[PDB]
RNA sequence: UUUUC
RNA sequence: AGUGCAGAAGAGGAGAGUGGAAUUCCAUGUGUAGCGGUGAAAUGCGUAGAUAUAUGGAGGAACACCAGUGGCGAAGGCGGCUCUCUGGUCUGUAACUGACGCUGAGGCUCGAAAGCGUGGGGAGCAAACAGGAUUAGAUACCCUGGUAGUCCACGCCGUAAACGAUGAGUGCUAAGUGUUGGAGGGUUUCCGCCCUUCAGUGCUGCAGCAAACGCAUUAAGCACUCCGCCUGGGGAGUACGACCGCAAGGUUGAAACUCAAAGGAAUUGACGGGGGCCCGCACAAGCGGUGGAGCAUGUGGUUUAAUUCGAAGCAACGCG
């Protein structure tokens, strides 16, 4: 019961749209879990590909230590 | 002991000067069970804390323990493999308790062959805030607080 | 010399050692102690009071050459790095930031025999 | 987290 | 049982390219007496500058979080990312074929790790081996080193606790509750409830079984079809013979002679260098002590022409 982010009509997830991706990663910089955004099993897995693809551009660090 | 706490062996105040905490000073002297004496010495002591500089000796008493008796302690505990300390808090009985320990420890070699004007000028100097014992308490909370860095998370 | 006026200290600690060492803004290395440096023996460096005594015998050198601010660099996941931090804020320095990096790897090599005691 | 019963 | 029409999911496979972090080595700046290691040490490395520390350079392997009783594949197994080739599965419908099906001795294909041939590569890791420790001994556990191998290509061997120790095909028999992918009805902004219906995937449970254990719509229940296998424990998956392999070895597979047992599960008691709770001058707080001196004793030892005999941790030593 608890609200999934697709409320909105949004299909594809845009690719770069970091207002829509900034909510799942933390602080520091890792993912966070689907139990804890709590959402479908399709877009964890089609936001983990997303940020996959979007770690490799620079659009997005790995490490956040210095 | 196990169970949990305990009585706490109530007492009666003098015949003369009406004090549990002459008492206790007393019942700290006696050895062996010779309570004569040490009445002998105690009375003695007070008189002659009477004659030079001093009016009321149940005060000049308490004036000696109020600086000399402490407000913090360590305590060499141990947690998960190694022993360490850490800056305790005390009861108001065992402050006492501890007062009259630094005290009667110090009150045994001062150097005089009178056996209570050592007692005497102990607590005089200690209401004069000199000799060891009230720089003993003074030590006691040196060291305390410098442990207060490795103790406080625990 | 030169009032450096600031730096970043290092500290590594292992399960049998912790090892202390000052540097420069980048930086050069200024002094170190360790635990075994101060006279100490095998498995009495797992203190944290010889971490205690260590890094405060490490800022003695490092603040008569001018220094009052320092970061702290830690390594070595241990027992005694948080009282090498705790009494290095005693002796007079200005601990302003603390950065804890122990580098995870993401699954390159492997670990050694996994023991049998 | 030392061998032995 | 199929095929067309319309959708859906996925670490299913091969080929090609690319990313970040980490360990080691190299180069250079700072830096000096230690570093590493263990229950404790020691071998080892450091004054020819180590560890540490900052900047780049090299190269090989594995892919943090995502990650879940999730998913995919006939099993072995498959998780960084992108593109090219490509297999299988599920849901609505039944206009199309008119029984075209199941199982399958020999045969063919695939097959974790270790091993073999030839050519490459070699960062960690580590059989063999060397040295340091423990022990009465230690060719072992612990520590410092260290090769073949682990990776790639092309061939070879065809094995396991390859297990759900449960062969495949199909029909029937109370429920309850989570999850993965779908499809319909209405409340409906339902895309955020509920009801109905397909499949896989967990868990608790009734008739029924079973030696109990337990199984129970994903039967070890009720029944048909087809295939493989068993007949006391050892001797032994050994000998001999036949086929395959470069080789190690694989597949098929006895008897001579021995014993009256070997077995499955479930109770009771004992035990464990297995665990969870409680108590006790057992710890903790305190007071006074023993081990120093000297003396009285009881032992052990040594000694005698005689050292009368018993008592050995708590539970022998101002004991009989």
Known sequence: ?66 | PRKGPVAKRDVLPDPIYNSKLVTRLINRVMVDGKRGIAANIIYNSFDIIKESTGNDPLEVFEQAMKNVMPVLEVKARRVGGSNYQVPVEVRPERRTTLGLRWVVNYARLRGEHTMEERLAKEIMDAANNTGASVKKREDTHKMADANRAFAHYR | KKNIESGVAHIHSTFNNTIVMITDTHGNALAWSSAGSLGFKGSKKSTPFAAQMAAEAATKVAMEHGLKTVDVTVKGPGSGREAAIRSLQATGLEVTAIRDVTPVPHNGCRPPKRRRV
């Open chain 1, 1 to 66: 019961k608890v609200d999934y982010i697709a409320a909105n009509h949004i299909e594809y997830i845009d690719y770069k749209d970091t207002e829509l991706l900034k909510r799942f990663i933390s602080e520091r910089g890792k993912i966070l879990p689907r139990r804890v955004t709590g959402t479908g099993a399709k877009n964890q897995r089609k936001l983990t590909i997303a940020i996959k693809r979007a770690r490799i551009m620079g659009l997005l660090p790995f490490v956040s230590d210095e």
